[PDB]
Write a protein that binds this ligand. Sequence first.
Ligand SMILES: *[C@@H]1O[C@H](CO)[C@@H](O)[C@H](O)[C@H]1NC(C)=O
Ligand SMILES: [Ca+2]
Ligand SMILES: [Ca+2]
Length: 432
Amino acid sequence: PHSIRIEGDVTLGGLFPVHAKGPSGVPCGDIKRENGIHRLEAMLYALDQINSDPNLLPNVTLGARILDTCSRDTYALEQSLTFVQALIKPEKVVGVIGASGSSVSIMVANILRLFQIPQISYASTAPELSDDRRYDFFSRVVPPDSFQAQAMVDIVKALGWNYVSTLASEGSYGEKGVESFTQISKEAGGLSIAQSVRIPQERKDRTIDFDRIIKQLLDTPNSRAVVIFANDEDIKQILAAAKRADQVGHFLWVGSDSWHEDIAEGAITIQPKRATVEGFDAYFTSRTLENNRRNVWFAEYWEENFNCKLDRKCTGQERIGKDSNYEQEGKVQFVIDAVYAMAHALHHMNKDLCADYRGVCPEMEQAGGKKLLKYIRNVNFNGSAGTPVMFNKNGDAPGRYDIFQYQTTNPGYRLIGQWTDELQLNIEDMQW
Ligand SMILES: *[C@@H]1O[C@H](CO)[C@@H](O)[C@H](O)[C@H]1NC(C)=O
Ligand SMILES: [Ca+2]
Ligand SMILES: [Ca+2]
């Protein structure tokens, strides 16, 4: 109902959107099965892995205080005060994993700075978080969208889409993405923005006409492509409308939280490199109501996931993946790697400040978050998908993206390239 509290020598805070935003006056709405429950469980799995690992924090157990953000920055701010109760068996929190949404992470980062508590996000890509003046204690295992914007300009230019229109969801994400993309395009040369269209907020009183919006973009003079900065709901409707359109277009889209469908052939997207962590699937799919009381939200997840109540009644014999559809949520790798980054930082701090000791020294206990922050910023290790985890001077993961195209040759998103220190576009793998 409230929180997951796990005792340990040092305690990690966690922030996840276990629930969506509630109706209007209510803070919390429905369970978010993938973005909330899978991500939370990824942290719990990571802690279990570290706590059984004899070569990482050999004599130091990791505990946790994991809280629900209800996808609201105000609610998360209030929750975050739990992490400082020892200062103001009182819980002393050395670092925080989260939040998910960028607005949530920003708000959280503002309070955690004041108490010198380092934070590592597994999903927040807002460029403003890279500014170490305002967000010195904030790091992230995902890259900022500033890198993504450059990659988009690079792809658009390489494909010869020298006149484009932009389409963005209403909100600060879409506005920021378009101004960022626009600014980079001005600096690059050979790329002109024909028009910028904004999608209205999804009000219950109306139904947005995506067919009209797409038709107008495809009839714009000069425009070779549409570049899309979208939320989850908007992207699904935009690409369905694109598929239904009278004319074929070129589409490049970013945003959403994903990693039968109605998607226009050849639509391109660019998203941070990630992969399935197989050990997590075995853990998560074997969870039951009997063996997973640790997750205090798991009974609610169960009722939603199997459409039953504890009006079909839950038996407890339902199994994840058998009686429901299961695919690993795309950011599980990042949650795990955030937790491992914190652990590697603590391991090195312990080895530098301590020796031959059961648990944490007074010297390590006295080091504080400013010092742990430096250790965090200097970690360098192979993460849960066998790829390197590190941060730049601003606390940002390097810009490493895969490029996908939706294909109907023989149907789904296919890997057609990547953007790292170079742009690799495999023109031979693309549909023409
Ligand atoms: C952990 O405990 C063992 C046995 O007491 C000891 O040899 C080792 O030095 C300890 N490690 C650390 C990092 O304190
Ligand atoms: Ca250990
Ligand atoms: Ca930062």
